[PDB]
Amino acid sequence: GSSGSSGEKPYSCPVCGLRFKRKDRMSYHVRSHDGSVGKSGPSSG
Ligand SMILES: [Zn+2]
Known about the structure:
Helices cover 24% and strands 9% of the residues. The chain has one helix spanning 23-33, and strands at residues 12-13, 18-19. By secondary structure, it is α+β, with helices and mostly antiparallel strands. Zinc ion (ZN) binds at residues 13, 15-16, 18, 29-30, 33. Homodimer. Interacts with RNF4. Interacts (via C-terminus) with TP53; this interaction inhibits TP53 ability to activate transcription.
């Protein structure tokens, strides 16, 4: 797949196929696909 733009829409959801205008909104959607999490355990103290 080739977009074809020197530089437009720096924030998009190519994972599923859905462009976005907001950077904070796309981060909540695009993330919905690539799920990852596993903070460290409770350290002493
Ligand atoms: Zn998406």
